[model samples]
Target: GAMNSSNYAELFNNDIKLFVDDTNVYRVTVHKTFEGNVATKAINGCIFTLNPKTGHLFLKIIHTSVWAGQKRLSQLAKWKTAEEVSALVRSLPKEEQPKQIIVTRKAMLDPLEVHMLDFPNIAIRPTELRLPFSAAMSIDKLSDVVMKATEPQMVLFNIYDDWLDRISSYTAFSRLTLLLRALKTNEESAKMILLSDPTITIKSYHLWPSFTDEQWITIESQMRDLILTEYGRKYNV
Candidate 1:
């Protein structure tokens, strides 16, 4: 597979930070820099949010230009500060808000950038959550573990009930765009199993792969072309 410049850029060239707001929306700040300081005036940045329940999206941009410099006052001036960029989200209708709010420091980048980072509120990455492939591992065991691991609260599921209290409405979409947005590789197949099976959906927390993008491709390819066991096809072994 070819190297995806966007993925490579995100992994190294960008600084991405996420903060959970009082409303439980993820306030994400993304900026690009060379060495340690701002890259250049020609670069652009963006801010956006996603409603986990509705999959609604909102956004703003820090449009940078050589002539614009750093402090030319105007509509662009409002985007100079993080607080102002965040307010763009706050100004929107409360109903259309999102779980993640992105603030960038240069030309607008891809929204999928943040999704690749997984859900917010992560403090640790546990080895137990890391699934390793082996011929000796039973399909039934994998199924059980995957079903439980994908649950949102258990993994990325929002446990903030108080945020719900702040909301004036509720709705449900079994196929959340949130899932579709950040999908890397095996997740499409994973989504089918998770959404179609009532057993999985009812218990579904945050359906995401534990492996990195490269690892996921390797594993999926092996299962697709090399694995000949009945369990491989039957349970994605």
Candidate 2:
């Protein structure tokens, strides 16, 4: 009895499990078996979040190098199952990735914070945009913070034309200025925004982004009013 099918397309069956490894931590695990491949598994995860108050969703892969073995992450058939979980996530919903979009590298991260990534991108669709940190700073450090934050490298397509019309043509620097204003205008509204002061989905919580890539500063955690409130008081010109 030989095999009936070898179509990699069909073979990518949903041998995945969606369970809450803990509260608000939606764990998506995928299983892939390449013909006759015996492999040990390493658990890698991406923390995806959505700010219900803001409608911004963020995603970052935690990656796997914990055991210090690769090229074969332990006999696995080049396991990229972690990312596969992200793909599965997209099929469910938005409010999501690609080229013709921006891809830059600005990695001034706060070690392990995810709610706010101090990055900038105005043309890249609000839903997929990275949230910049709203912190009051000396005028000298103002641009530095924005510049440091602007290093997110997310790709975008699918045309969220409403926002694209605004920033697509301008240079990346001005784009930063626009989003800064977007976050902190005198008005209490979300306009010309990025990193949405950053949506929720499926299981009633854990709200995260659709799908995005490139340095999120490994950013996560709730938006802190502690620093955020002060920014509005001062440097919100």
Candidate 3:
């Protein structure tokens, strides 16, 4: 059987389901120059390549040029599946399997996703909701897909008791882009600000930038801890 994950996908016509669900330091690359107990180490699937010659990181190099440095790391990251993992594990040889292993895993958003988020406190009548081309299928195509269906005009209705006023208006102008709309009930929805943004129209949802540095750290630790608890138990280590 082929050992390389680079080969596995093409060879097996396998579907890659990357739900980065665990984190391990299965192999550790320690920077020896550092004088510290825990020392310094890199972890997980955020593989990157740095060239010292560039003088600085953001010198207009293409991302692929940067990513080029991590062929082996990418393969290690590519390593997937139950059998594939065990195969790699049992076959460990060379400057490999230090016994003090450091493995990298994926981030699972499950726990954070499980909690209920604050609702937008708005309502949407079916008629008020506009459809994007993706959702608003052609009449024939729609007819073929569902022999049974709801009336085409508006199947969605998000109800909220109105006469308005429950906060967010002051915050709306204070900030920008208070995009709000039907919450889709089970999925997500989107846009810009007020004055600077908007009172906002009935549209999809909006996006914020990345989480704060502390929050980023917290999530990574949570993911790592979750992976450790689950796998450490499963492997009975």
Candidate 4:
């Protein structure tokens, strides 16, 4: 639950803007503020905590942060079933819900399992076609996952496309790394670039940095919109 203070301090100090719930505001101090038209509610199994001193949000600070843990979530010993929990949590007003709702699930039973936590995934594979194992194999894996996934809209690779016609070389491993690096998270790295700096598209995916805080905020909104318009479920499963 104790994240290094640097993560919040560094990002929020920059161009990033964060909107948090009262719980998060209390994690750091006593004074908490919630402003905006639409807000999130404290319902379902959702919870939050914040550090007001640096405006650092230790959001959804949950235990058992794993896929199986969450996937196997039950109403038996716990308070809510997966579906019931999900629906109740979804009912909260958007503003009351913390910007980031970290889902902690423990998964030890299934060694090979994938999680479709959020929709319109921000994930991108960072691998390429191989020699002994052709790129087809990798794509097959990706395809398998996509076909089985319920809520996600897409999956892209940050590295590994020979068809781009821009890069001089074609490699798979580097491409895989690219996808991993391209992931739009809070982490900062050299290969990463801002998504909102403004650039023209040329029918090619630009290898830019991962999404910023504000950018992720916008993405959250977009995903919410998708759920409302397409799924009509109020939230992704």
Candidate 5:
């Protein structure tokens, strides 16, 4: 009698139920992914029921399938390493691991905060830019708080020459100087300007630029009245 099919195989199968004595046999299908160049494994076994009265056990192996192994974690794998799991959250990079500035309120945070004007760009495209914090110790009144808010550490003014020839460029330059003057002469709200060449997305957002600590400090001192009037008055510590 040559046995070929599962129908016969299962009928004659020597399930664990017959021979097991003390242990309970549970059958289940367990799926597991393997990493490091290994195939996935699935366990398909029949759950063994125990006869409490007799203290007997049964065995039944379930069907198995091709399990994937040796693969990286899926996008949803949230397991962090021991260090990452137990480590202080502050030690982890809250933002992307790139060379960029994040602005904050009190001092320029290890990150830098941005003015209200730049929030859209920073949030919508975090990959494109990063902001440490929103304006701080600063009045909301545009004219009253602009100057002391400090010039941006750096900025990229995009411009477009399509609409009104040099109109966009002039507008950008003028706004920049106006912002600078506001910071220099009187207190004004620190905002950003983004001009462009050709055409750009018709949205309210700007590009990012790097700023140095020294440059910001210089601007802050020169614009003493503006800074002191707005920030010092409001956030006097």
Candidate 6:
């Protein structure tokens, strides 16, 4: 039988599992099937997972050669042949890939260069927003970190205390930046709520130097400017 959008999408679908947080942020895991098709010769099967909030991605591939008794990587649950994994990941839905590819594995760095050759949209380098790290942190945990900071009160706290201080840690900075971006993308009502609440005191929780009046103004101004410059005047704020 075929399918339509109105039908229960995941009823028979075992490929993906999605978890959504209170802020409407989503993390998805898509499992690939290894059914011995001719296509499997090029790339066996794998998993693709992403956290939209922080733009974290996890990609696991089982190279065809692995099944053929060639490459030996007992550590990997599966595998990867640069060219093969590239095509395999490319075949996935465009929405599944993030503009910012955070290469979590040092081993994947070289392969990503090859993958980027075919997918130019991929920004996987120093200046293009790719962040290479050797951390074993799970992307799923991003939702928890992101949600707490996205709350209106937290945003206000950071703002008053100096966003710079709150973002001093790379981990904190990255998560906070993502939270702000997500709120803008999702059109969070919390923004307006905070803006309208006059009783909300502008006190810093931390006794740190805050952004100067001019700096704050410039930061806000530049944010809008930067987005429009990239996306044009027609781009929705």
Listed per candidate, the RMSD to the true structure in angstroms reads 18.4, 20.2, 26.7, 20.6, 32.2, 19.2
- List lDDT for all candidates, in order: 0.30, 0.27, 0.24, 0.28, 0.25, 0.35
Candidate numbers, best lDDT first, in rank order = 6, 1, 4, 2, 5, 3
TM-score per candidate, chains pooled: 0.24, 0.19, 0.17, 0.20, 0.16, 0.27
State candidate 6's TM-score: 0.27
Task: Give the C-alpha lDDT of model 3.
Answer: 0.24
TM-score of 4: 0.20
Compare the candidates by TM-score and give the number of the best one.
6
- lDDT tens readout by residue for model 4, 1-237: 212323434223323222222111111113334653452222112122122222232223222222223333332212221222234235545543323222222221111112214322212121121111111112233324333544312233333233224332222233332333233221232112323345522224422224444664554454344334444443454
Model 4 off-target regions past 4 Å? 1-71, 74-176, 182-197, 202-237
Q: What ranges in model 1 sit over 4 Å off?
A: 1-41, 71-81, 93-237
Candidate with more favorable, higher lDDT: 1 or 6: 6
Q: What is the alpha-carbon lDDT of model 2 when measured against the actual structure?
A: 0.27
Reference-based lDDT, residue 219, model 6: 42
Which lDDT tens digits does candidate 1 get at residues 1-237?
122223322212222222211111111235577667643333333223323343232323333431244343333332233343344434545543333333222221222232224423322111111111111012232224333432221112332222233332121221122222222234445345334434322223332333334544454444443323433666885
Mind sharing the TM-score for model 1? 0.24
Candidate 5 lDDT by residue in tens digits, 1-237: 111232222212232111111011111234544554534333322212121112222222222321124233221111111111112222325452212211111121112222212223322011111111111112122212222323211111222212123233334333233334443334343332111222323343322122234543444354444545666666784
Assess candidate 3 and give its TM-score to the true structure.
Answer: 0.17
Q: Which stretches of candidate 3 lie above 4 Å from their native place?
A: 1-210
On lDDT, the leading prediction is 6
lDDT of 2 at 120: 26
